[PDB]
Amino acid sequence: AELLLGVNIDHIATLRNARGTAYPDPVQAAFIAEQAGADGITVHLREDRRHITDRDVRILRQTLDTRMNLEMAVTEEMLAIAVETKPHFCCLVPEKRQEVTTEGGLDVAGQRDKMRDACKRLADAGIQVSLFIDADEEQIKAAAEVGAPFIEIHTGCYADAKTDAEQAQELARIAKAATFAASLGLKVNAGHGLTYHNVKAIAAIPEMHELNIGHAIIGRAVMTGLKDAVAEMKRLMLEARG
Amino acid sequence: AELLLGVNIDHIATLRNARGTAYPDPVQAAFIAEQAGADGITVHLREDRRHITDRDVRILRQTLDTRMNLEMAVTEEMLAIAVETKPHFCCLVPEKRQEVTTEGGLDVAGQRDKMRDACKRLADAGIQVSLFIDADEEQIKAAAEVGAPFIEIHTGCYADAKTDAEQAQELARIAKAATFAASLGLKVNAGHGLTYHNVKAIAAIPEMHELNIGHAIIGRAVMTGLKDAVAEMKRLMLEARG
Amino acid sequence: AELLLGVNIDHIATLRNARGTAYPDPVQAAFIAEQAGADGITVHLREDRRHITDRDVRILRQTLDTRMNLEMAVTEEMLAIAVETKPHFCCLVPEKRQEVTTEGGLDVAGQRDKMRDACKRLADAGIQVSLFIDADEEQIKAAAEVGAPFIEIHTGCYADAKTDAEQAQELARIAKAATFAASLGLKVNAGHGLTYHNVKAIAAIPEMHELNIGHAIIGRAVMTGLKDAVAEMKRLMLEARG
Amino acid sequence: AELLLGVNIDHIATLRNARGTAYPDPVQAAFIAEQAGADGITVHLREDRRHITDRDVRILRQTLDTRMNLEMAVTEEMLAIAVETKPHFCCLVPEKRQEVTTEGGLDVAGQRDKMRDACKRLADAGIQVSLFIDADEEQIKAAAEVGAPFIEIHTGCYADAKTDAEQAQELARIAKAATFAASLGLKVNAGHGLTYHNVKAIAAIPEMHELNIGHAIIGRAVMTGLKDAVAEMKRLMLEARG
Amino acid sequence: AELLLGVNIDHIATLRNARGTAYPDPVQAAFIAEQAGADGITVHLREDRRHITDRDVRILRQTLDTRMNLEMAVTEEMLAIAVETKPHFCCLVPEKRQEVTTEGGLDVAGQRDKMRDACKRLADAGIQVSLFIDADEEQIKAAAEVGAPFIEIHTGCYADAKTDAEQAQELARIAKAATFAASLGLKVNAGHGLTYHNVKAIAAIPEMHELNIGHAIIGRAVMTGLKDAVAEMKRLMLEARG
Amino acid sequence: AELLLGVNIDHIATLRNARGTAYPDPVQAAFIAEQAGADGITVHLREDRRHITDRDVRILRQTLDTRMNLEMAVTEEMLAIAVETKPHFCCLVPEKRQEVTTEGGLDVAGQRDKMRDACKRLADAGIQVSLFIDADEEQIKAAAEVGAPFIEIHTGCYADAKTDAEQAQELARIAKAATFAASLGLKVNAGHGLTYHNVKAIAAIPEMHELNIGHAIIGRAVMTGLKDAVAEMKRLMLEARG
Amino acid sequence: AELLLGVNIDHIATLRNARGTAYPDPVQAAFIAEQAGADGITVHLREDRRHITDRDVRILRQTLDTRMNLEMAVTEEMLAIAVETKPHFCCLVPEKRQEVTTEGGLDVAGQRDKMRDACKRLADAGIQVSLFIDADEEQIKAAAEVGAPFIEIHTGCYADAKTDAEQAQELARIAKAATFAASLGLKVNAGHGLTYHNVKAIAAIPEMHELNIGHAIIGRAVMTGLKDAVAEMKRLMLEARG
Amino acid sequence: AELLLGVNIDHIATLRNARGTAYPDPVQAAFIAEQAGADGITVHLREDRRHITDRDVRILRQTLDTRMNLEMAVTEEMLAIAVETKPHFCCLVPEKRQEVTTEGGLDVAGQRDKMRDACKRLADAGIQVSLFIDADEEQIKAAAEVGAPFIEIHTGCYADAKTDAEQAQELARIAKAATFAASLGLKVNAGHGLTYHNVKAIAAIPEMHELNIGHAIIGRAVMTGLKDAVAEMKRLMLEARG
Ligand SMILES: CC(=O)[C@@H](O)[C@H](O)COP(=O)(O)O
Ligand SMILES: CC(=O)[C@@H](O)[C@H](O)COP(=O)(O)O
Ligand SMILES: O=P(O)(O)OC[C@H](O)CO
Ligand SMILES: O=P(O)(O)OC[C@H](O)CO
Ligand SMILES: O=P(O)(O)OC[C@H](O)CO
Ligand SMILES: O=P(O)(O)OC[C@H](O)CO
Ligand SMILES: O=P(O)(O)OC[C@H](O)CO
Ligand SMILES: O=P(O)(O)OC[C@H](O)CO
Ligand SMILES: O=P(O)(O)OC[C@H](O)CO
């Protein structure tokens, strides 16, 4: 069916938090996005609450007209929050307290029991889990074995390719990994580093269910405003599939 | 004459730097702003290059169609940069390496010789100096004594007033300080924390020459886009004087 | 000095409640307005929770960037809710469960004790109280005697005049009542029934502090969108003072 | 040819009637919709004239540039009005005087004679009849037998689905029902509860002739303006079919 | 009192009647105009019904949110229609069945009895009457003597001026004539031939109450759309008064 | 080959000529149209010069960026004008001095010699000739026999259809007639009476080369502006072909 | 009355001529400017037809809705063209065949007879003459003596000011010159080098009748579009006078 | 697969250089385009630095977000500049100092040695080389033999065709040349003379990788603004492939 767009509004809070003011408010960015092409909203509640905060999640949970996709690290604090919050989607990601952003898929194959616990735990609460991982068969077989219904392939390496050949190489690895994951019964998403200029190649991949894009959109938004930024990204996505 | 607007684009870089990507690029934000009501562009080259970087200043110096107002801490590194860069305006501000943002006027009365050196030094290079200070007579007499041709009153306390009375109190102190400074031959600017809802009271103050606003504009921009954000702030300013 | 605009978003909620869906959400309408010329947001908590709900007030209170003006009846339930909510402003209004929409002004001259307590009570909680009253000297004197900081003159009869002469009649009545109110040291607002075609005459009255407008704005909004609706109204208001 | 959009403007009037003012006028909204993607305009003349009025239907009938689709209960009052008004389309729904909105499908199977004479009478007047019903084979077979050329499948349950699973089930139920209705020679529409986020899966169903949508469009319009609200909906609809 | 704008939509019907179609419909044009700066809608029912028809007048009378200004010739047909329609305003003009447009200027001084009975009759029906005349003090004194509360100075000669000097002369003529009219207690309007480039000089005349403009606006409209055309005219009008 | 759009700006002049002014100028309308989706500009020089004049034709011939399609009657006057103007295209139509608009359909089969000499003459001047005819295979066979490279099926009956059935019948008629025409080597255009709501069915006909639309577009234009009106039509046309 | 804006569209043509294509057409730009704040259109027919052509002047003369202001050198070629073209205004400038742009003012004082006969000849043709000169009392006195009704002060040096001090000096020089010219009965315009950032101080000068601006407006238009470019300039101009 | 758009901003600079001011600045034009549908920016460094300057290339290289396509002559100066600049793409073009704008295609078949070296040289520097050539098999074979990755077919003759037949002639010639080029393993682009009215036929050619367009876009831009100019072109291109 229709490829979907998950808009990550973390960086609205990044701008807010830089100053300690109330604006810009993620809650406003969520309404705009949801009416301009976003099929869902994503927020990464970082342990260090760098950008998205507890009030953000709490108020958003009440105001989203679509659904929340809560991104989080695998810890007891977070699992308890997710269970209490009951987001529709949950994407487990690797975290370091002071990293710039995310860059290593989640190491599922290496923490199989931790993840297995997380997946069972969140599902019991009625949350659909997605594991943020690398276009790596080892990590994918592990996500499947562990029970997760969704995986989201890290498109970072593709987005940072330094040459056209290097980019084609990564693209191919993502497409193969997508087909591979699907053959194991997993639904697959993608995201991170996706921009207005490299999104179509990823959107074209058939197995892709939803693309989670954040930074590039907010980066376009300061110039053109969120509404147009979201609608334009969505248009590019639908074009890639037609 | 006409009240002027200095748009601070630091937070365009804040968003860029959060990810290490090239966008959003301050250079684009500068063209947009300069064509939507900004009479000048301001950038704060922080020692820790948190947001605005050396390439930013170097490229902006070549692309600004109006003029640069370089905000900086008083150090030999910065003075050498300013002298080499030759910005049209220079605003000396107090810096701590890891502060959220600025909150203490510059302590001129306490470093009279340092400032006296800075002012003479920059002026020799053909730079018009402004000292970012508090609506404090002691600091103002000091700025005058030291030679600076401009001062910029810190409107932070006013912007963070917690009650209507507390706000009226601060407003009054800023207006009195503005009149006081002018009586000593200083031209006076204002800025920091200025928003769409508290700018008119400051713009109304006759002695005000230019208002330097940043965060609130970028904060509005993510929603409506820079162009409208800048034009709207400028309109509110001109309305306050008519 | 500068005439302020208070936008009442009640009817965003009537549209929502007509169905029991979540949209259109008052919370979104607030951000749009505050960014299009509104200086404060107004919401009337009806006894029958006809439109604005407790939920709305609870979230609005945390999402507004300007300040809340809570219109309500003088009942123990509401006073308790107001004291608890701590809105910046509170406007006391007459209210019948099955009324179409506020009949006229509060009877202050006839319930000096009840009102005296309501005021003091709210004032103790840090709320600036406005008594919605008719352009009647007896009521104004009463309001002043009771200790309210503000009054809001009812513009309903003016908006309902069936002839140019009847309208002019009401106009002068409001204009005199306003000068009178001010002479007793009361700040004075006005509202109810103001439209894009009759606001300027009211806006031109010097003594007016803030105009509270809702229905006509939402009515323009379903055609043009809330943003231009709010901006147009504000524009018209400022021209009248010009 | 292409999927048609019937825009129900009932809620423009609920906004009007909430106050008794003349605005917003349904007549205006009609021109905007017809020029923004509406192929027809829909109005439900309720027993209690809650929103649309005899006045509205009387003027719309003379101003609509496309065609009127009159929704109404099967009562002598409505049939008489229908026969006299001669709208292009008439949609027969079940109605309780004080319901929030239409609840379910018309009970056709269990009221064959009532409906058989209703369709016949309206047809003698040259009106094309559509019976609003549940995605129910029994109700569908009956609709055909009583001679109606159109049926409109209630999409309400699909819209209210509490879980993705429930939703997919309702979807399948509607698609199967639509195929069955068509096999019987019926032309089929769908509507009630359709939004910007659930409209595509319904539009994708091949048998669908025209979709009738109201509340969701009006709820978007208060933010966005009716023009864009309608165009965005028509856009999503054609995309779904492409 | 702000200068008012009366928008004549006759030429919307000129376009419609040129083909026999039902569009463009003057009824839609009226809603757009009243919401873009028009304080009133003007229509000239012509004997030959070349543009505005009885239908238009009958529907507009029910859809106008502001008020109707019916332009007509002084004949039995028209007077009976006006009394039955009961427009807020009515402007009597010279009419010749085969004319391009109004030649300009009622001969009031040469027909005091006819014009006296017309005004009385229209005023008995509660219609404020405007006598369309030339910038001639004889016609003006006559207008006052016959009982009309309004007159509208014909701006056609000013508009068709062939030299800067002739224009200046007509401008000075309209101005002095307007001051004279006001001294007689007459409210003075103006119109016919006004354009985006010659309206300011007329708007600057203090005594002017309302300007009635039509063709120029419709001619701008086919290019830029009715909304911006009305708005632009009103904007130039208000600027001239400041 | 994409379906092309020929925009007839006759009615821009209808509005101009109604007053004698110089605006709105067909010349400006042509630039807007050619840049908003029009692949060619069409003008019908009428014997009574009711709208387009010799001036228009003479200036348009020098300002058109695409190409002119001159609609005219088959008379000596016109043929001489066309040969002198040398329009890229020329469409011959039935003409009666006092007609509302083109009645529809050249009698080619009843005047083979006249039409044969006309085509030759225009083709000698290098003008590609289009014979405006009815969806009649006799007229079509004749058109081919006389030597015309183009014909334009008259869509007026389809447009004025009074019932869904009559419309369908005319649609099927235009379609089969177009297939027949193409089999004779004729390029087939269509136009007259097409609107935003009936253009798709005609655009979907594969054999169609260019559609010539005028009035509907000008009627939309007075409301929304020429640009969006042309664009909207072209958009619906291309969607129909997909 | 109000400050007038003459928009010079020469550089629309430099873009055209750089390629020999027909676009962009000056004729189109003229309609856009005249409807966006231009009170007149200016063209400089250069000796080398670098941008504007005889063709342009010939068509503009027939399409301009306002008036043409022909800029040209004082040569037999240009005077003859001027006399024949009959533009409303003619501005006499100094010109070298291969200059980048006009360098300074016309040498009037030192060529009295040449200019005296030029003004006389153009005046016999009914053209209003303006002599482009430096803010020079000698050149100004001479301009008056040779009979020119207008002078246009070169704002070039003010525009090129290398320092704020230099700029203020030039400003003062122009304002004083303007006052002097007026005392001599001359009407005075100004232009060349005016931008969005230096236009206000010039517009503020009371004696200024019309400002002629070109390059700056066209430079903004390639980014922004001509419409907004012209409207923004007219906006800044009226603000300066208010 | 997905046709790419390369926007040539040369003529932004011609407009700038016509005066020697800093605006319009190519650097601003780049950001706008890259964000409106351009996939890469093209600039031609002329020997005479007619428009694009070394400054432009130096900054552009650091500000572009997509990638540079440097068009240049095959000279030691340019090769040195290219190797030093390291543009993503480089297109070799024939160039005469006083030419109006690139005459035709490079002569590769006649200078196989020179080109062989240029290619290898640039390739060693990491640049993908495109040989701008005529749709001539001899040249294509040559280009393939020499080792260039790409060729860019000259669309000038196609754009200049004076008859529909001549245009069609050129079309097929380009289409065959493209299939031919591809069969030799060459990637193929096209450009020069493409406009909004002739791009689709070229865009529809399967083998096309990227179309490089400049002048027509800047020409549309002075009217509508660069953003809509770029977007429109891209939109048209994508529809042709659709
Ligand atoms: C894993 C990923 O792709 C991102 O969603 C990451 O959570 C973004 O973090 P920031 O928003 O802090 O950049
Ligand atoms: C002193 C002041 O008002 C600001 O300009 C300060 O330099 C802003 O720093 P940030 O931009 O990092 O918030
Ligand atoms: O790199 P971003 O900003 O595209 O963020 C990605 C989404 O949240 C996916 O995890
Ligand atoms: O607080 P801001 O963001 O308004 O920043 C202020 C200006 O640079 C003034 O120093
Ligand atoms: O009449 P309304 O709808 O403008 O309501 C006004 C606000 O509640 C202020 O009283
Ligand atoms: O649910 P609604 O309000 O969208 O409207 C339903 C349509 O009129 C269909 O009957
Ligand atoms: O000359 P018009 O077309 O502008 O309109 C005239 C007004 O209606 C005056 O009555
Ligand atoms: O019927 P119209 O006004 O749309 O225009 C007809 C076209 O010009 C066909 O020739
Ligand atoms: O400097 P310019 O290009 O703005 O134009 C000058 C005006 O035409 C005045 O002469």
Ligand SMILES: O=P(O)(O)OC[C@H](O)CO
């Ligand atoms: O003809 P242009 O102006 O489209 O120029 C095209 C680019 O340089 C590509 O060759």
